[PDB]
């Protein structure tokens, strides 16, 4: 529960550049592992990230999921906690979120990490 440190918002392609750091990964539920202790989220540009759980799911997740955790040595994310975004008459646009992720990183001085 690294909730008292800054967690960087990233996408798949940034996994390898954030090994061992707290990150926040928002993606769409693609697949749940038979055991329920892992699942894959695809980011706004169609790329996949592997999310590892300490405890198995108790409910079936779907739609947009926001994961907070630490990137492991194998470029997966070891989840500390996750939330499932809700969606009203307006569906969540993952494409634009990926863009805000690319912007966040283009302007670190206007979106400081801690």
């Amino acid at each position: 529960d690294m909730m008292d440190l800054p967690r960087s918002r990233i996408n798949a392609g940034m996994l390898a550049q954030f090994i061992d750091k707290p990150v926040c990964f928002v993606g769409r539920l693609e697949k749940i592992h038979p055991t329920g202790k892992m699942f894959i989220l695809s980011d706004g540009e169609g790329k996949n990230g592997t999310i590892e759980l300490m405890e198995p799911l108790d409910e079936e997740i779907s739609g947009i999921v926001e994961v907070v955790g630490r990137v492991t040595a194998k470029a997966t994310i070891l989840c500390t906690s996750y939330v499932q975004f809700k969606e009203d008459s307006h569906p969540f646009d993952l494409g634009l979120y990926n863009e805000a992720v690319k912007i966040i990183h283009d302007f670190p001085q206007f979106y400081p990490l801690g």
Binding site: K86, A100, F110
Partner: protein, 121 residues
């Protein structure tokens, strides 16, 4: 006016008297978008720990005089003004609203960035 911000920007503001400067530009009324991690119903005020991922959760206070607590893990839009005690900054909010549409959350990122760009010096 109201400047869109991140808690990391807030915790890095300097009080040059009783007035706050966000890096270089004065500011007081601000907006943030985050998740309630914890909610504490005190006597006359509800205190929330809101988190936007940019730093540790921040204390956001709401003076509520005589059903008003937003549940934890709910994404919210907070609007108030920056405050400070013995160096520990907080937020007094006139508004804390559960985000109906999460795209409003992504838009805030855009607003924060284009607000510190166009107001930078």
């Amino acid at each position: 006016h109201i400047v869109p911000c991140t808690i990391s920007q807030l915790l890095s503001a300097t009080l040059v008297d009783e007035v706050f400067r966000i890096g270089n530009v004065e500011i007081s009324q601000v907006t943030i978008v985050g998740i309630i991690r914890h909610a504490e119903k005190a006597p006359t005020n509800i205190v929330y720990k809101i988190d936007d991922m940019t730093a540790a959760p921040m204390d956001v206070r709401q003076w509520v005089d005589t059903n008003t607590v937003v549940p934890p893990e709910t994404y919210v839009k907070v609007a108030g003004h920056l405050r400070s005690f013995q160096n520990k900054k907080s937020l007094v909010a006139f508004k804390i609203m559960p985000l109906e549409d999460m795209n409003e959350f992504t838009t805030h990122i855009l607003e924060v960035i284009n607000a510190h760009m166009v107001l930078s010096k």
